[PDB]
Amino acid sequence: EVLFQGPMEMILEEKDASDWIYRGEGGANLVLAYAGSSPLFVGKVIRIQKARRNDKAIKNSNGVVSVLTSDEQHLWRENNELISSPNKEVLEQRYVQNVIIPLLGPKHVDAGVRVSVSKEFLECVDKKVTKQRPLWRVNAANVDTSHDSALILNDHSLFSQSGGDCISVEIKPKCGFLPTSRFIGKENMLKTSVSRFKMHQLLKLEYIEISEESEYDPLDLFSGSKERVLEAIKALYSTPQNNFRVFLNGSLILGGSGESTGRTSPEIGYAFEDALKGFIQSEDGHRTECFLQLVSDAVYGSGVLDRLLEIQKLDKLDIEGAIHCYYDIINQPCPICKELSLHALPLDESLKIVKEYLIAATAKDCSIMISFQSDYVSLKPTNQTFDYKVHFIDLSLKPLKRMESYYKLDKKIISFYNRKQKAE
């Protein structure tokens, strides 16, 4: 018998920063994979929240940096724990656990485990990975070194703890339905027949954020038709932008690193066809088409997109309707109106509409990771069998204040799209 230390919460210190390497980033978070040997962290990633360089901290009426605004505290009040969260990491944990998982189900979703971190750990991590980051990401934001916590997650690009290579695919599917809202005016009619994703591509192109419009159409992927699902995967492969990434054993072999990337050219195709050597048994020039059928069969077979789309549809009125409830919620005179129905609703209904809008925004912006290992898919072509797992990531809580930005962006997108279409 040997005396062990009592339980003690893990704290990442300056020295541990060298054990973590850049995996990627979205707008709000940086993600690092563990490169060490400690059993606590093998097969895990750490998720670190970023801070925009200009942003002023949220403070309550006593001037204390706080997690939620009073408005958000009221919007999310249905769950006592969630609105009590003492920091941003707990907030995200309880959001996923208490809001999303009751809607999406626990099989494909994990709220993550919190770990304490020193200011110096975050500063060194910030320093170490700068050279890996897209320069425009660096311009905009860095690690938030005021945080005392981060989130540990399972590394989905590894089908690990024996099984050989693991090819994982990340899909960022965006919004899969067209609005029917009565609050969309006749000048904005094209919103009821052309996906947000398609219209946004044109604006992204105008701002030189992409080199070409994507071939991907979310309506295909969310169609529930195996044949249209396959067409979406082929589209994502052709123009990955920031919607499609492939990893071999955790290393990126297709798609961008922390950003969108250009169309898959013949040469990128060759490298990727070579990268599938062994994983798929096929004669040179046919592995990738087998690979895309594999991905397609796993997306369609799992049906994870069905329940995700019902949550996206919690955006029932479109931002053009929901923006009016927003201004009622915070008791500000509506600048959109110059209405009834929406403004005559009881406060509780307005709150509900806005809360469901923000839940729907979470669902329109998350990603799916599907890892494969030789729940299984077998390809009718080459006669192989692959186990696979599916996992959601980036089911993040959106700030209530963003309703104003959502309305302004939406107005920008449809305005520009109309101008373009009117050029005949």
Ligand SMILES: O=P(O)(O)O[C@H]1[C@H](OP(=O)(O)O)[C@@H](OP(=O)(O)O)[C@H](OP(=O)(O)O)[C@@H](OP(=O)(O)O)[C@H]1OP(=O)(O)O
């Ligand atoms: O920076 P990008 O790679 O272009 O991605 C962003 C980002 O999504 P990620 O969190 O997945 O990176 C935004 O979310 P934040 O990170 O800033 O919270 C999101 O904004 P919303 O979810 O608030 O809408 C926005 O989506 P959208 O453009 O639909 O508003 C989306 O941009 P794209 O997916 O269009 O590139």
Ligand SMILES: Nc1ncnc2c1ncn2[C@@H]1O[C@H](COP(=O)(O)OP(=O)(O)O)[C@@H](O)[C@H]1O
């Ligand atoms: N649990 C995970 N396992 C493996 N890779 C992940 C995991 N979480 C995130 N990533 C990778 O890191 C990237 C950024 O993560 P994400 O949380 O989407 O950033 P943000 O929250 O800023 O949108 C993703 O595009 C994905 O490739």
Ligand SMILES: [Mg+2]
């Ligand atoms: Mg995010």
Ligand SMILES: [Zn+2]
């Ligand atoms: Zn109004």
